Amino acid sequence: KTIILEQLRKISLPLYSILSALTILGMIMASAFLFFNIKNRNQKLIKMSS
Amino acid sequence: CQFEDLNKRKDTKEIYTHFTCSTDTKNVQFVFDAVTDVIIKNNLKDCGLF
């Protein structure tokens, strides 16, 4: 009765790491946008757009 | 320029200048559009968008 395992069909770890790197890069870019928007909240051009 | 230099609130109050004559149609259209734009500028100031 050869032993029967039960392995999970796992998500690759390098793929997860690459996509997490890309999404944290996107998140820090979004944060930089939030900063450069909230620092220049007084120039009229940025003030016409809520 | 001599009239504009009488404004002590140059950075706050806008002064409009129009040169008129007895034979024109822009004399009456100017003020029609000018005050419409003033009203829009005022309501944009009130909301703080500008």
Swiss-Prot record, chain A:
Residue stretches spanning the membrane: 18-38
Family: Belongs to the G-protein coupled receptor 3 family. GABA-B receptor subfamily.
Subcellular location: Cell membrane; Postsynaptic cell membrane
Protein name: Gamma-aminobutyric acid type B receptor subunit 2
Regions of this protein lying in the Cytoplasmic compartment: 39-50
Source organism per UniProt: Homo sapiens
Subunit organization: Heterodimer of GABBR1 and GABBR2. Homodimers may form, but are inactive. Interacts (via C-terminus) with ATF4 (via leucine zipper domain).
Expression tissues: Highly expressed in brain, especially in cerebral cortex, thalamus, hippocampus, frontal, occipital and temporal lobe, occipital pole and cerebellum, followed by corpus callosum, caudate nucleus, spinal cord, amygdala and medulla. Weakly expressed in heart, testis and skeletal muscle.
From Swiss-Prot, chain B:
Modified positions (ADP-ribosylcysteine) in chain numbering: C47
Coiled-coil region(s): none
Protein location: Nucleus; Cytoplasm; Cell membrane; Cytoplasm, Cytoskeleton, Microtubule organizing center, Centrosome
UniProt binding sites for GTP: S22
UniProt-annotated stretches for the region G5 motif: 20-25
Top-level taxonomic group: Eukaryota
Function: Guanine nucleotide-binding proteins (G proteins) function as transducers downstream of G protein-coupled receptors (GPCRs) in numerous signaling cascades. The alpha chain contains the guanine nucleotide binding site and alternates between an active, GTP-bound state and an inactive, GDP-bound state. Signaling by an activated GPCR promotes GDP release and GTP binding. The alpha subunit has a low GTPase activity that converts bound GTP to GDP, thereby terminating the signal. Both GDP release and GTP hydrolysis are modulated by numerous regulatory proteins.
UniProt similarity note: Belongs to the G-alpha family. G(i/o/t/z) subfamily.
Disease: Neurodevelopmental disorder with hypotonia, impaired speech, and behavioral abnormalities: An autosomal dominant disorder characterized by global developmental delay, impaired intellectual development, delayed or absent speech, hypotonia, behavioral abnormalities, and epilepsy that ranges from self-limiting to intractable. More variable features include non-specific dysmorphic facial features, distal skeletal anomalies, and brain imaging abnormalities.
Assembly and interaction partners: Heterotrimeric G proteins are composed of 3 units; alpha, beta and gamma. Part of a spindle orientation complex at least composed of GNAI1, GPSM2 and NUMA1. The alpha chain contains the guanine nucleotide binding site. Identified in complex with the beta subunit GNB1 and the gamma subunit GNG1. Identified in complex with the beta subunit GNB1 and the gamma subunit GNG2. Component of the TAS2R14-GNAI1 complex, consisting of TAS2R14, GNAI1, GNB1 and GNG2; within the complex interacts with TAS2R14; this complex plays a role in the perception of bitterness.
Name of the molecule in the record: Guanine nucleotide-binding protein G(i) subunit alpha-1
Organism whose genome encodes this protein: Homo sapiens
Annotated gene: GNAI1
Whole-protein coverage range: 305 to 354 of 354
